[PDB]
RNA sequence: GGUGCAUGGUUGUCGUCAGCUCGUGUCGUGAGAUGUUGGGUUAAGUCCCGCAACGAGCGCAACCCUUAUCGUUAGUUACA
RNA sequence: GGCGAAGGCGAAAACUUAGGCCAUUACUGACGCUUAGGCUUGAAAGUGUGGGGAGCAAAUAGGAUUAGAUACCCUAGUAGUCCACACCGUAAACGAUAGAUACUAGCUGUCGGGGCGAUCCCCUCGGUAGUGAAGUUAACACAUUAAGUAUCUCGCCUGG
RNA sequence: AUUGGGCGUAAAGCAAGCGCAGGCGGAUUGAAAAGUCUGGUGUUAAAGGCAGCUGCUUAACAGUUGUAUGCAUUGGAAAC
């Protein structure tokens, strides 16, 4: 899943 | 248009009977004319799905690393990318462990400095010989660190153009935790890459359409205007 | 924050006019609450291998949960020409020893479980066999995830 | 006086020989390899082009002396 | 390259004869596999009953080399090398890889056959080989013809 | 080596085959219950160990209640 911050 | 599928003319194809199961959800059964082709729903989602987490790990200031190794046209035209937003960028491979630490990478940019702030002065005042080989050196740290001069730590992202013409590059890639991001083709392995990009890099067209679809997400990601993917004019850009 | 030796081996290249001698040194670390590592360096001396070996094991950290000090299930790992068994034990049982094996679970920090080996002892290969034991542990909440019944039955 | 199988130092040897290694990282479960590989390149690992290798050290070169050319300080106890 | 269970099979012709592959909308009905002992076959050599023997060549003879050559280099040459019957059954008699049984990435091929057609290419079902994923192994390696996966069985190994 | 091994090269797949006995073996549905599981019944002595206890100052020891499968037999079971 993305949204890596 | 959003990467309207209209444009879309050149993604679908390969090379012909060398594939393998994992590419088996994006082919269809082949006889009309054994050139690997792709299917167009799937592709679509999926570089959406890509260009919208790039965009969202890009807010917060992320790091992208291209591979341009790739003969000239895509190899300028990144470097060209790599350039206006200042990020990492190579034009040769890695010769192995170039992803792995920082220690051969710091000595390296002081070098780099050193030899910027130092070299000019020297033309003539020092040996000619000292002007070739600081020359040389210069034209080394170009090859390798001239792409790569700003890290405060490894970048968080790439994109690697073709993983099995850079087996190496991906190896590193799946070694770190870090994220990765990557083209697939009808040879490439879209099990070890975290992103699946099923788009062909053999015909320059399909990589300058990723490229402009990367440096779109990047551009709108720190400010920067929109050349494609929310243009609705076609993609123009011919070969060379 | 163990930093236990396991073994020390002689090891030489051989080339004209004599041969390469040097040492080579194993070390395995644990925090006894989960987290454990392994290393094994070669040196012409003692600091150089024993600095990488800490540092690999740094590297090499892997983590464990706590299970009411032991292993609640039945396993076999097979790894470097050896078996090793493992199952649990009861609270009040005691702890077995077998130099390696005894040394990777007191990394991992337990005090009951009972154990087999099987095979050929060269330490190397008992870590193997150790980390193919543990690292394929089974948890209630997984296979819980995994399925429709939450509960045990 | 013996004990260079108790020694240090010193010297010969391959040998003016080009290899000796190590740090980082990777591969191989290991002894190891990777570098040090290959194509050019010369005497040299001296150098270059690519390569899962990047660097660093050592011999390797330059910084010692003489010869052959010239300017200049000096001109006798040389020169005449 | 093909056919063979194996040993192995390559001048032509004829005769007797075994086995295989393809679809069987034709059929019986589980009648199937293994196989201790039991039986058949089976490279080379060899022995009797004789043949034949162009070369070959053990054994042997002579010469040359060699310190020693008793071997090797050479010239002869016996048995034997081939035919019909009786026996010996063992060998690096190897895919150093048992039988049979289905299931499991792929690719490069090759052969036979049914569709089809100038060939050529294609699909298909079997055979024959190479590359090679996962996997299995101490390693080499093996890998749809497995040392994978498992299964019924016999034979076998308990350090030198 | 049932638990709990292997035979490509470390020891071993016979040279291969025709196979008797033997072991194993497609699906369906029927009886019956041989194997099998299970509930009662007779029996499985003494003693030893195990658990509880009594006696010696304390255990060793002795004594005491249960504790030992399995065989036959009555009743269910029809998945193989």
Same mark, same amino acid.
């Given at each position: 899943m993305g949204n890596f911050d | 248009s959003l990467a309207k599928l209209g444009e879309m003319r050149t993604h679908v194809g390969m090379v012909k009977r060398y594939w393998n199961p994992k590419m088996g959800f994006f082919i269809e059964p082949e006889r009309k004319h054994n050139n690997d082709h792709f299917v167009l729903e799937l592709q679509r989602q999926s570089l959406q799905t890509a260009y919208n987490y790039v965009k969202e790990v890009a807010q917060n200031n992320g790091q992208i690393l291209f591979v341009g190794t790739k003969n000239d046209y895509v190899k300028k035209l990144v470097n060209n990318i790599a350039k206006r937003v200042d990020v990492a960028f190579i034009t040769q491979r890695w010769?192995?462990?170039?992803?792995?630490?920082f220690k051969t990478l710091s000595i390296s940019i002081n070098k780099l400095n050193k030899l910027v702030e130092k070299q000019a002065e020297n033309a003539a005042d020092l040996t000619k010989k000292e002007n070739l080989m600081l020359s040389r050196e210069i034209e080394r740290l170009e090859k390798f660190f001239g792409g790569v001069?700003?890290?405060?730590?490894?970048?968080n992202l790439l994109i690697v153009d073709d993983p099995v013409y850079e087996k190496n590059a991906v190896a590193e890639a799946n070694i770190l935790r870090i994220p990765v991001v990557a083209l697939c083709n009808?040879?490439?392995?879209? @099990?070890?890459?975290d992103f699946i990009i099923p788009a062909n890099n053999h015909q320059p067209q399909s990589t300058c359409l990723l490229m402009n679809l990367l440096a779109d997400a990047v551009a709108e990601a720190k400010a920067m205007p929109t050349?494609?993917?929310?243009?609705?004019? @076609? @993609?123009?850009q011919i070969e060379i | 924050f163990e930093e236990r030796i396991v073994k020390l081996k002689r090891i030489s290249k051989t080339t004209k006019g004599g041969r390469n001698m040097r040492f080579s040194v194993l070390v395995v670390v644990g925090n006894r609450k989960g987290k454990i590592g392994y290393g094994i360096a070669k040196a012409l001396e003692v600091p150089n291998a024993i600095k990488k070996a800490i540092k690999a094991a740094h590297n090499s950290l892997h983590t464990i949960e706590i299970h009411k000090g032991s292993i609640y299930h039945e396993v076999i790992g097979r790894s470097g020409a050896s078996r090793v068994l493992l199952k649990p034990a009861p609270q009040g049982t005691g702890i077995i020893a077998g130099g390696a094996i005894r040394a990777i679970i007191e990394l991992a920090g337990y005090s009951d479980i009972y154990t087999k080996n099987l095979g050929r002892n060269t330490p190397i290969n008992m870590i193997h066999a150790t980390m193919d034991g543990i690292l394929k542990q089974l948890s209630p909440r997984r296979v819980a995830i995994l399925r429709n019944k939450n509960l045990n039955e």
């Open positions: - | 010769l192995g462990g170039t992803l792995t630490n001069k700003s890290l405060k730590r490894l970048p009808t040879n490439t392995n879209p @099990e070890l890459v050349m494609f993917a929310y243009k609705p004019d @076609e @993609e123009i | -």
